[PDB]
Design a binder for this molecule. Structure first.
Ligand SMILES: COc1ccc(S(=O)(=O)N(CC(=O)NO)CC(C)C)cc1
Ligand SMILES: COc1ccc(S(=O)(=O)N(CC(=O)NO)CC(C)C)cc1
Ligand SMILES: [Ca+2]
Ligand SMILES: [Ca+2]
Ligand SMILES: [Ca+2]
Ligand SMILES: [Ca+2]
Ligand SMILES: [Ca+2]
Ligand SMILES: [Ca+2]
Ligand SMILES: [Zn+2]
Ligand SMILES: [Zn+2]
Ligand SMILES: [Zn+2]
Ligand SMILES: [Zn+2]
Lengths: 160, 156
């Protein structure tokens, strides 16, 4: 039932893949996600390929076995649980979205880095330019990226 | 900026969805009215025959207004602004799976938001607000402030 992890070495598993993209492109995508957050903290990240990782990452449609169904194209794009054991810390992408490498659909990198926020204990920012801002933001650019101030602050007030 | 020009409004649950037991349906909607009841001087009493101000019902695809549903996903329900006739009425898309929690589409929280529309509220730019145009939109629940201000500016 945690607000933070009590480790700062976490493990992660990409449980399955979406077909909207190559798996290499999904791993490049989610490895970047993590780095954003790695960069500003002493959290490390290691990949498992089986078993329970602290952060279980997956793609699911409509109903998917937790208690909060996804809901077709649009509406909610993703959800993730705060730190804690079992379900806590997991990431669930809605595959009724069209995931892509840029902005032509729903950018996977960027929903990924925000959702990693939730799993590291971050809640929703009120600043319009934060990653953690509830509202998805296409109008970019992306090979540009750098977390807003609010996120370095929000996240270091959790792991300094 | 339609308000109902009354302070007492009747409703009628014209039909029931197979998705749920009747008293989950009634219960989800009674609750919905309570959200709104407790921030207005509006009251609500139920009709079983006749024309209520707010006729609520379930439908599929094309249904007799000029606004069909589109199946599973996309539109969940619609509801008309205050006035006579079709006005004030509320329809639920029965291509959704209606649930008393978040296992499919939560009827209570769609009711809550449709009732806003029938009472004259419009979609909102805030995300915390009930009237934000997007699902999943806690299942035990507090109206946001911006919703609270919004209806109260119509009825006190
Ligand atoms: C970095 O872009 C994000 C912005 C919104 C979401 S969401 O539309 O799926 N959403 C919930 C939440 O912020 N997910 O983590 C808003 C929902 C209340 C409509 C997902 C990722
Ligand atoms: C919180 O409950 C709300 C009720 C219906 C939906 S809806 O997405 O199906 N929708 C239709 C209408 O506005 N009903 O309220 C808005 C969208 C199609 C613009 C969204 C949120
Ligand atoms: Ca976990
Ligand atoms: Ca969705
Ligand atoms: Ca998809
Ligand atoms: Ca629909
Ligand atoms: Ca009516
Ligand atoms: Ca149904
Ligand atoms: Zn989930
Ligand atoms: Zn979020
Ligand atoms: Zn209709
Ligand atoms: Zn609406």
């Amino acid at each position: 039932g945690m607000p933070k992890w009590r480790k700062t070495h976490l493990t992660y598993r990409i449980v399955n893949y979406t077909p909207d993209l190559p798996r290499d492109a999904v791993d490049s995508a989610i490895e970047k996600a993590l780095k954003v957050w790695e960069e500003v903290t002493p959290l490390t990240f290691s990949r498992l390929y089986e078993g329970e990782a602290d952060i279980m990452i997956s793609f699911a449609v409509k109903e998917h076995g937790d208690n909060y169904s996804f809901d077709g194209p649009g509406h909610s794009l993703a959800h993730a649980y705060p730190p804690g054991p079992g379900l806590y810390g997991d990431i669930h992408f809605d595959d009724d979205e069209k995931w892509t490498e840029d902005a032509s659909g729903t950018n996977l990198f960027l929903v990924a880095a925000h959702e990693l926020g939730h799993s590291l204990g971050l809640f929703h920012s009120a600043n319009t330019e934060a990653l953690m801002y509830p509202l998805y933001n296409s109008f970019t650019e992306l090979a540009q990226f750098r977390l807003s101030q609010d996120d370095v602050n929000g996240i270091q007030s959790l792991y300094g």
